[PDB]
Amino acid sequence: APSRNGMILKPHFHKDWQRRVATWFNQPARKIRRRKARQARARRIAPRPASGPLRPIVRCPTVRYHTKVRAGRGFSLEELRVAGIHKKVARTIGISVDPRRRNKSTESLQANVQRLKEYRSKLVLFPRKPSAPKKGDSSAEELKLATQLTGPVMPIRNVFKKEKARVITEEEKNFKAFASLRMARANARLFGIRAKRAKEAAEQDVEKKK
Amino acid sequence: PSRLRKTRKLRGHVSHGHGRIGKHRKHPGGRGNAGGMHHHRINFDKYHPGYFGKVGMRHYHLKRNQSFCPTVNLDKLWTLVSEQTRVNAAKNKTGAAPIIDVVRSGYYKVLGKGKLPKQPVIVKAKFFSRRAEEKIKGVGGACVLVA
Amino acid sequence: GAYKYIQELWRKKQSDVMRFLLRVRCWQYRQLSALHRAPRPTRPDKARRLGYKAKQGYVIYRIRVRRGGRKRPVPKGATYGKPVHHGVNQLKFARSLQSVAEERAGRHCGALRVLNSYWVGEDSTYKFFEVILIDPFHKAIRRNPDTQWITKPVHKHREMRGLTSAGRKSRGLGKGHKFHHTIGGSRRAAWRRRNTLQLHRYR
Amino acid sequence: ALRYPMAVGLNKGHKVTKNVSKPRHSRRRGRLTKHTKFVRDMIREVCGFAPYERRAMELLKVSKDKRALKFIKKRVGTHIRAKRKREELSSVLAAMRKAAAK
Amino acid sequence: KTWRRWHRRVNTTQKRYAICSALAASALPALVMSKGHRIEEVPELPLVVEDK
RNA sequence: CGCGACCUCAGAUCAGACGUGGCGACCCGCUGAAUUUAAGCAUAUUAGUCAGCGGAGGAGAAGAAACUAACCAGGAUUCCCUCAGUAACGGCGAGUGAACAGGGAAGAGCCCAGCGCCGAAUCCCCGCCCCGCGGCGGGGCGCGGGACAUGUGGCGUACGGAA
RNA sequence: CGGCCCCCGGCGCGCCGGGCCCGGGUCUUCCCGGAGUCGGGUUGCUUGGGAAUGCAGCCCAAAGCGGGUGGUAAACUCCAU
Numbered sequence: 018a019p020s021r022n023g024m025i026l027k028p029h030f031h032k033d034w035q036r037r038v039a040t041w042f043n044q045p046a047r048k049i050r051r052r053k054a055r056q057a058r059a060r061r062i063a064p065r066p067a068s069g070p071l072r073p074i075v076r077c078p079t080v081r082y083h084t085k086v087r088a089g090r091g092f093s094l095e096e097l098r099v100a101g102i103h104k105k106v107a108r109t110i111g112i113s114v115d116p117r118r119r120n121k122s123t124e125s126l127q128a129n130v131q132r133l134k135e136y137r138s139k140l141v142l143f144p145r146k147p148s149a150p151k152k153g154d155s156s157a158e159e160l161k162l163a164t165q166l167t168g169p170v171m172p173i174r175n176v177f178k179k180e181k182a183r184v185i186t187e188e189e190k191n192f193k194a195f196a197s198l199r200m201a202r203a204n205a206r207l208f209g210i211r212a213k214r215a216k217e218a219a220e221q222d223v224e225k226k227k
Numbered sequence: 228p229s230r231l232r233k234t235r236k237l238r239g240h241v242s243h244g245h246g247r248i249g250k251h252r253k254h255p256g257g258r259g260n261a262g263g264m265h266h267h268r269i270n271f272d273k274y275h276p277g278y279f280g281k282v283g284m285r286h287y288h289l290k291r292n293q294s295f296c297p298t299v300n301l302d303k304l305w306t307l308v309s310e311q312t313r314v315n316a317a318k319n320k321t322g323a324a325p326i327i328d329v330v331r332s333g334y335y336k337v338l339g340k341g342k343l344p345k346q347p348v349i350v351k352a353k354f355f356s357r358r359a360e361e362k363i364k365g366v367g368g369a370c371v372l373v374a
Numbered sequence: 375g376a377y378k379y380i381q382e383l384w385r386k387k388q389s390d391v392m393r394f395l396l397r398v399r400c401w402q403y404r405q406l407s408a409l410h411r412a413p414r415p416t417r418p419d420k421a422r423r424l425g426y427k428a429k430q431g432y433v434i435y436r437i438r439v440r441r442g443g444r445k446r447p448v449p450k451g452a453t454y455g456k457p458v459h460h461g462v463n464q465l466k467f468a469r470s471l472q473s474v475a476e477e478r479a480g481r482h483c484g485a486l487r488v489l490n491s492y493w494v495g496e497d498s499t500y501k502f503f504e505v506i507l508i509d510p511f512h513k514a515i516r517r518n519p520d521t522q523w524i525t526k527p528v529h530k531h532r533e534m535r536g537l538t539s540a541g542r543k544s545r546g547l548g549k550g551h552k553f554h555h556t557i558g559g560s561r562r563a564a565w566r567r568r569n570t571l572q573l574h575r576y577r
Numbered sequence: 578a579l580r581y582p583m584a585v586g587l588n589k590g591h592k593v594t595k596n597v598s599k600p601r602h603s604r605r606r607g608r609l610t611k612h613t614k615f616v617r618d619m620i621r622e623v624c625g626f627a628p629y630e631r632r633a634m635e636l637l638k639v640s641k642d643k644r645a646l647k648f649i650k651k652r653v654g655t656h657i658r659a660k661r662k663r664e665e666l667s668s669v670l671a672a673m674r675k676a677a678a679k
Numbered sequence: 680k681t682w683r684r685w686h687r688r689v690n691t692t693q694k695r696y697a698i699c700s701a702l703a704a705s706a707l708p709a710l711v712m713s714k715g716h717r718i719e720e721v722p723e724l725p726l727v728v729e730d731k
Numbered sequence: 732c733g734c735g736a737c738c739u740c741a742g743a744u745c746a747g748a749c750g751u752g753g754c755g756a757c758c759c760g761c762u763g764a765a766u767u768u769a770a771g772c773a774u775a776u777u778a779g780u781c782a783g784c785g786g787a788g789g790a791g792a793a794g795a796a797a798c799u800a801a802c803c804a805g806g807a808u809u810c811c812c813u814c815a816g817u818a819a820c821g822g823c824g825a826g827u828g829a830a831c832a833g834g835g836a837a838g839a840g841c842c843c844a845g846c847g848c849c850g851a852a853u854c855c856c857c858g859c860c861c862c863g864c865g866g867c868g869g870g871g872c873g874c875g876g877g878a879c880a881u882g883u884g885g886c887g888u889a890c891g892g893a894a
Numbered sequence: 895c896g897g898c899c900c901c902c903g904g905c906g907c908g909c910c911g912g913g914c915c916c917g918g919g920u921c922u923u924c925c926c927g928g929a930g931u932c933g934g935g936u937u938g939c940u941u942g943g944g945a946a947u948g949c950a951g952c953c954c955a956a957a958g959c960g961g962g963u964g965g966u967a968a969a970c971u972c973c974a975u
Contacts, residue, residue, distance in 0.1 A: 018256030201586025
């Protein structure tokens with residue numbers, strides 16, 4: 018029974034919602050449970066980073082965002098073949114590897130290669146034996162590092178490029194942004210139909226010959 | 228605070244603030260928005276016009292990511308950049324014309340609401356308005372698109 | 375090998391060579407009981423693709439399933455309620471008939487566990503299926519690292535819970551926009567999350 | 578001039594170069610290998626044709642392709658699979674007539 | 680019921696507002712005695728001692 | 732008119748094991764209403780909810796795309812927020828009502844059939860010896876049996892693989 | 895960040911008896927796909943899914959530069975995955 022200017026409300030309480038009420042008094046205990054397991058996870062892998070393997074440079078789909086850079090699922094095999102690391106060795110060394118990721122662009126490929134190239138430089142690979150085999154690390158690199166890396170390894174900086182204050186020329190001033198935008202909007206709508214008027218007229222030019 | 232509630236002042240009154248002739252029954256008018264067309268029609272007509280009926284076409288799988296287009300006006304344009312950018316303008320005998328990247332901050336279309344101070348600029352946006360251009364071109368700037 | 379030709383021969387079921395074979399088999403299995411053990415698979419390549427290996431402990435059965443839908447188990451009328459639920463004849467059972475064959479195989483043989491089943495013929499009144507059973511305690515499976523996962527007590531009676539391929543299709547689970555349900559744990563879990571009103575500490 | 582990367586119209590999107598890459602092996606599936614082609618003709622040689630195809634043999638003989646296509650559409654399914662059924666059966670007529678006119 | 684609104688959330692600026700007024704009221708000894716504390720012999724109300 | 736293999740099917744107080752039943756707060760697979768609302772009521776709503784049935788586990792289920800997207804593209808599954816009380820459904824009435832993306836918690840990938848190549852190169856059981864045996868295992872010896880060519884084991888699975 | 899005495903567990907080191915002598919890159923030659931299943935018609939249930947989201951009974955029932963998907967049914971053509 019509405020009276021004197023309320024909104025037409027549609028509460029979804031017509032079901033027996035009281036049997037399925039989810040209380041959140043577990044929130045502080047769940048935070049301790051997650052945190053005490055997070056510290057325990059980091060103590061089992063003593064020299065390894067707590068966050069885990071390295072994540073790639075990934076741009077957003079869904080043109081709403083279209084500019085933000087996320088932390089991806091893993092490095093693709095096309096990115097790994099450039100850097101020279103086999104796909105079954107990158108998992109063991111601490112590189113996230115997924116086979117599903119395609120690579121349509123080129124600048125994003127070198128972004129992930131450069132991320133992997135300088136990652137191998139700062140990586141401290143411990144030898145399997147105490148007597149170090151070939152292509153391990155020197156004993157001088159070990160003793161000054163007995164700590165992990167809190168947070169994600171190489172945190173991804175959403176960076177922009179600073180522009181130089183350009184001097185506007187008259188050649189730029191003649192450009193009409195609204196007039197060109199409306200022209201391109203009309204060309205996209207009429208691109209398919211204009212291909213019909215040309216082809217039947219060209220077929221009508223065949224009637225001139227035949 | 229139940230001690231500030233109206234129920235504490237109603238202790239003693241027989242009807243408890245809900246009428247003596249018509250008692251507070253369970254649901255006199257009906258549960259919810261009962262009777263949109265019947266017996267509650269006047270309230271729906273003179274307070275919520277256009278509540279009933281269909282209008283327009285139906286778009287089945289509508290995604291908000293395609294129709295994302297945040298707008299910014301020319302009056303709030305120099306707030307996109309720092310204060311030292313605009314004070315280092317109309318100076319040095321060059322016409323510095325600093326570049327303001329609209330897409331970098333998180334806006335797409337630039338609208339022409341407001342008054343633009345007299346300083347030529349370069350604006351980088353995915354969309355523009357007709358009235359937006361003539362204010363910038365009237366000042367002496369230039370618009371550059373980006374994708 | 376010969377496994378490729380046997381596969382592609384069985385895809386031409388309308389061809390007259392297969393109509394003779396499907397006629398003789400469906401006649402033969404109709405004279406037997408509704409549930410009995412087969413010693414060797416009628417379709418060897420189809421059994422191997424579903425996980426059957428010809429070694430010790432891999433048992434197969436054959437179960438006859440009556441053809442038709444599901445008549446509602448109520449008396450003559452006696453469907454008291456709104457006129458929606460007055461239909462009893464044209465009702466279809468939500469689970470597949472092949473999954474019923476797996477269900478009945480494990481009900482009779484509770485010691486073994488079903489891997490999967492496959493089609494061996496049908497009649498207008500009956501459907502015939504062959505279900506692969508695995509001894510969990512036979513040392514040929516018990517000592518094999520590829521097949522001792524079924525010996526775990528998690529996979530107790532997969533036919534009851536719809537974990538086989540015939541029961542997985544009836545649940546309507548999968549990836550993508552085509553389903554938009556079973557997006558939690560199962561279809562029941564998808565209904566749960568959308569109906570439990572989450573009340574926080576601070577709201 | 579004024580070649581700007583417009584957001585709409587026949588060239589929309591940010592201008593990025595595309596690297597040439599080999600196609601995935603997942604995309605290979607469905608290609609006819611000569612070995613499975615060597616298997617498939619023997620199966621068609623042994624078990625023969627289906628009853629619905631053998632009825633459609635004569636409609637191709639009398640040049641009644643519109644009714645033949647309508648029969649396959651009611652018998653197989655959609656028009657894409659109904660069309661593709663027709664020419665390979667029409668290739669049976671071409672192979673059999675050539676093998677008979679020797 | 681268990682799902683009554685037990686917890687109340689206050690804005691961080693408001694939570695930081697009262698602590699600035701609580702620390703500033705630790706001075707002005709008329710406030711401290713009005714609480715009831717015996718301060719008459721304290722040499723100075725902002726008692727700062729060493730790190731020892 | 733018999734013997735001897737093979738296939739199908741029996742009898743076992745045969746030798747050695749396995750399942751039944753209970754609990755069932757959470758989960759999975761079915762079956763499954765009417766109270767109630769729509770001021771009546773029949774679609775709708777209650778609700779795939781109550782009841783009934785079967786099945787386990789300490790978690791279960793799901794899970795590594797016949798995916799989302801149309802982007803300068805993301806990338807197993809599970810949970811929270813947000814999208815959202817939105818697109819959409821509805822005697823378009825009551826009401827019902829998701830999903831993408833993004834930020835997080837966690838994050839691990841793989842194995843077969845087939846295609847092939849290796850002298851069945853494989854596996855189960857019985858007897859003897861050594862070790863330890865109160866979650867019956869490791870090695871050796873046995874023209875000691877059986878399974879297996881109606882296909883066991885190794886390489887090998889879409890990220891290509893093999894020679 | 896106290897003490898004493900038992901029992902159990904995992905991580906390290908050594909010994910014995912075994913199994914295993916298993917890489918990557920370039921070039922050449924080969925192979926690679928799961929059927930009464932997809933799909934279509936119809937029926938019933940369900941779903942926000944609306945010219946049918948999903949699940950089932952019946953009938954028809956495949957192909958391999960193929961098939962599935964690209965939220966309006968159908969035909970043609972480029973594509974994307």
